[PDB]
Design an enzyme around this catalytic site. Structure first.
Site, PDB file in Angstrom:
ATOM      1  N   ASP A 142     136.089   8.465  73.514  1.00 51.75           N
ATOM      2  CA  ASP A 142     135.735   8.264  74.926  1.00 51.75           C
ATOM      3  C   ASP A 142     136.498   7.089  75.513  1.00 51.75           C
ATOM      4  OD1 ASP A 142     134.527   8.334  77.450  1.00 51.75           O
ATOM      5  OD2 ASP A 142     132.520   7.865  76.718  1.00 51.75           O
TER       6      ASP A 142
ATOM      7  N   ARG B 228     135.988   2.539  81.966  1.00 55.98           N
ATOM      8  CA  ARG B 228     134.557   2.192  81.873  1.00 55.98           C
ATOM      9  C   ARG B 228     134.145   1.665  80.498  1.00 55.98           C
ATOM     10  NH1 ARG B 228     134.946   7.768  82.118  1.00 55.98           N
ATOM     11  NH2 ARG B 228     134.419   8.852  80.177  1.00 55.98           N
ATOM     12  N   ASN B 229     134.976   1.838  79.466  1.00 55.92           N
ATOM     13  CA  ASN B 229     134.579   1.396  78.134  1.00 55.92           C
ATOM     14  C   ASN B 229     135.413   0.247  77.653  1.00 55.92           C
ATOM     15  OD1 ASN B 229     132.326   3.050  77.401  1.00 55.92           O
ATOM     16  ND2 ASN B 229     133.748   4.760  77.144  1.00 55.92           N
TER      17      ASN B 229
ATOM     18  N   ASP C  47     132.460  -0.612  73.438  1.00 55.11           N
ATOM     19  CA  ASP C  47     131.607   0.405  72.822  1.00 55.11           C
ATOM     20  C   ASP C  47     132.325   1.394  71.912  1.00 55.11           C
ATOM     21  OD1 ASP C  47     129.684   2.224  72.117  1.00 55.11           O
ATOM     22  OD2 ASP C  47     128.837   2.381  74.126  1.00 55.11           O
TER      23      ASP C  47
ATOM     24  N   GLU D  18     122.936  -0.542  81.768  1.00 53.56           N
ATOM     25  CA  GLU D  18     122.228   0.426  80.940  1.00 53.56           C
ATOM     26  C   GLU D  18     123.158   1.542  80.478  1.00 53.56           C
ATOM     27  OE1 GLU D  18     118.785   0.061  82.967  1.00 53.56           O
ATOM     28  OE2 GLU D  18     117.398   0.908  81.491  1.00 53.56           O
TER      29      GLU D  18
ATOM     30  N   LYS E 173     123.069  -5.932  72.980  1.00 51.70           N
ATOM     31  CA  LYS E 173     122.651  -4.552  73.202  1.00 51.70           C
ATOM     32  C   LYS E 173     121.362  -4.277  72.471  1.00 51.70           C
ATOM     33  CE  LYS E 173     123.970  -0.148  71.633  1.00 51.70           C
ATOM     34  NZ  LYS E 173     122.766   0.578  72.149  1.00 51.70           N
TER      35      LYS E 173
ATOM     36  N   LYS F 244     121.352  -0.585  76.764  1.00 51.17           N
ATOM     37  CA  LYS F 244     120.587  -1.486  77.627  1.00 51.17           C
ATOM     38  C   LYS F 244     120.999  -2.934  77.389  1.00 51.17           C
ATOM     39  CE  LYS F 244     115.847  -2.207  79.170  1.00 51.17           C
ATOM     40  NZ  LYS F 244     115.950  -3.129  80.328  1.00 51.17           N
ATOM     41  N   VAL F 245     122.131  -3.323  77.966  1.00 53.78           N
ATOM     42  CA  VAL F 245     122.762  -4.610  77.678  1.00 53.78           C
ATOM     43  C   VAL F 245     122.177  -5.791  78.456  1.00 53.78           C
ATOM     44  CG1 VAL F 245     124.991  -5.738  77.412  1.00 53.78           C
ATOM     45  CG2 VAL F 245     124.861  -3.247  77.371  1.00 53.78           C
TER      46      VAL F 245
ATOM     47  N   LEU G 137     122.201  -6.697  82.221  1.00 56.87           N
ATOM     48  CA  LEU G 137     123.454  -6.545  82.931  1.00 56.87           C
ATOM     49  C   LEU G 137     123.694  -5.074  83.296  1.00 56.87           C
ATOM     50  CD1 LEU G 137     125.668  -8.804  80.669  1.00 56.87           C
ATOM     51  CD2 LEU G 137     125.097  -9.389  83.017  1.00 56.87           C
TER      52      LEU G 137
HETATM   53  N1  LIG Z   1     128.431  -1.772  72.408  1.00 61.44           N
HETATM   54  C1  LIG Z   1     128.582  -2.590  73.211  1.00 61.44           C
HETATM   55  C2  LIG Z   1     128.777  -3.514  74.080  1.00 61.44           C
HETATM   56  C3  LIG Z   1     129.673  -4.539  73.820  1.00 61.44           C
HETATM   57  C4  LIG Z   1     129.892  -5.531  74.779  1.00 61.44           C
HETATM   58  C5  LIG Z   1     129.246  -5.498  76.009  1.00 61.44           C
HETATM   59  C6  LIG Z   1     129.541  -6.609  76.979  1.00 61.44           C
HETATM   60  C7  LIG Z   1     130.042  -7.866  76.731  1.00 61.44           C
HETATM   61  N2  LIG Z   1     130.152  -8.474  77.931  1.00 61.44           N
HETATM   62  C8  LIG Z   1     129.731  -7.616  78.894  1.00 61.44           C
HETATM   63  C9  LIG Z   1     129.616  -7.715  80.281  1.00 61.44           C
HETATM   64  C10 LIG Z   1     129.145  -6.640  81.021  1.00 61.44           C
HETATM   65  C11 LIG Z   1     128.756  -5.459  80.383  1.00 61.44           C
HETATM   66  N3  LIG Z   1     128.301  -4.297  81.055  1.00 61.44           N
HETATM   67  C12 LIG Z   1     128.655  -4.042  82.456  1.00 61.44           C
HETATM   68  C13 LIG Z   1     127.705  -3.051  83.108  1.00 61.44           C
HETATM   69  O1  LIG Z   1     126.451  -3.140  82.474  1.00 61.44           O
HETATM   70  C14 LIG Z   1     126.543  -2.546  81.197  1.00 61.44           C
HETATM   71  C15 LIG Z   1     127.566  -3.251  80.306  1.00 61.44           C
HETATM   72  C16 LIG Z   1     128.481  -2.232  79.691  1.00 61.44           C
HETATM   73  C17 LIG Z   1     127.942  -1.098  79.058  1.00 61.44           C
HETATM   74  C18 LIG Z   1     128.748  -0.123  78.457  1.00 61.44           C
HETATM   75  C19 LIG Z   1     130.124  -0.289  78.483  1.00 61.44           C
HETATM   76  C20 LIG Z   1     130.680  -1.410  79.097  1.00 61.44           C
HETATM   77  F1  LIG Z   1     132.021  -1.559  79.107  1.00 61.44           F
HETATM   78  C21 LIG Z   1     129.868  -2.379  79.697  1.00 61.44           C
HETATM   79  N4  LIG Z   1     128.888  -5.400  79.042  1.00 61.44           N
HETATM   80  N5  LIG Z   1     129.374  -6.483  78.306  1.00 61.44           N
HETATM   81  C22 LIG Z   1     128.345  -4.452  76.264  1.00 61.44           C
HETATM   82  C23 LIG Z   1     128.118  -3.467  75.300  1.00 61.44           C
END
Ligand SMILES: N#Cc1ccc(-c2cnc3ccc(N4CCOC[C@H]4c4cccc(F)c4)nn23)cc1
Length: 280
Positions: free
Chosen positions: A145, A149-150, A163, A22, A42, A24-25, A20
């Protein structure tokens, strides 16, 4: 070897579908945390295995209606995996931009209208993020952070604090060690202090993000320029979509003295009330 019991998941029960983003999910199926099931996974030295175990223990403890749900780890073999619920609308910043008046494409989805979010809706997103923050402050957890975006968006517009990070957001950090300077308060930039009060400042910037449908704070400025702004006391301007009551809450997050910043508990309470009855 005392510690928190972390749930372990057999590898055979994890079937990765596709990347999905990086760390690296990947998106995956998991049987059977219930039937079969979509989840986000992850992927990743012994020092790393140490941070892995450590973070895993922590993720296990921090569990709350607005923290992304953590299911466990898989460590039989390499690479090491962390398993989370899948938030189908991805990260909040991308979500916001796709519903911005600026968006180039229409954003289908059975659960929300395409086009600009309602004010009631923006307010609900902010309330939810704050609630996440209330919980974390409660535990004296300092998030260094906090930024859309998080955050993650799920079915029905549930928002949870997640995260890192996506390489597409590299522009949001400044290389010194990468700092999210545009979201940091003076005491962080000047004295390298990070507190729950620093998070309250950050959250204020998150509020500005939400009501600009995801624009970068100070997007006209270089990193050093934004630092000049933050330290010299200039504040981000009120977004056009943002009502006075909310801009007020923003300004309160941005007191130069940490102790004059309103508590996150207070902030959440006001946003929740605005949300239950959105002003015109
Ligand atoms: N630690 C951790 C962690 C926890 C949950 C997820 C998660 C669960 N459902 C999704 C759907 C899209 C997605 N994305 C979207 C873009 O591709 C990277 C990833 C992401 C990475 C970094 C921060 C983000 F808020 C989202 N993440 N995600 C990802 C990472």
């Amino acid at each position: 070897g005392s510690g928190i019991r972390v749930h372990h998941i057999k590898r055979r029960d994890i079937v990765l579908k596709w990347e999905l983003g990086e760390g690296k999910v990947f998106l995956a199926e998991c049987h059977n945390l219930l039937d079969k099931m979509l989840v986000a996974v992850k992927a990743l030295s012994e020092s790393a295995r140490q941070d892995f175990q450590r973070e895993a223990e922590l993720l296990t403890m921090l569990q709350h209606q607005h923290i992304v749900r953590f299911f466990g780890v898989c460590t039989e073999g390499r690479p090491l995996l962390m398993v989370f619920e899948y938030m189908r609308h991805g990260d909040l910043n991308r979500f916001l931009r796709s519903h911005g008046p600026d968006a180039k494409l229409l954003a289908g989805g059975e659960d929300v209208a395409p086009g600009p979010l309602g004010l009631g809706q923006l307010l609900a997103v902010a309330s939810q993020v704050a609630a996440g923050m209330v919980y974390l402050a409660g535990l004296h957890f300092v998030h260094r952070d906090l930024a859309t975006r998080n955050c993650l968006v799920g079915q029905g517009l549930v928002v949870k604090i997640g995260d890192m990070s996506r390489d597409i957001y590299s522009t949001d950090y400044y290389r010194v060690t990468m700092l999210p300077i545009r979201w940091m308060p003076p005491e962080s930039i000047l004295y390298r202090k990070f507190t729950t009060e620093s998070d309250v400042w950050s959250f204020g910037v998150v509020l500005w993000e939400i009501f600009t449908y995801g624009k970068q704070p100070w997007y006209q400025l270089s990193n050093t320029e934004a630092i000049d702004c933050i330290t010299q006391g200039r504040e981000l301007e009120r977004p056009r979509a943002c009502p006075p009551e909310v801009y007020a809450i923003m300004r309160g997050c941005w007191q130069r003295e940490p102790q004059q910043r309103h508590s996150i508990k207070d902030v959440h309470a006001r946003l929740q009330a605005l949300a239950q009855a959105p002003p015109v």
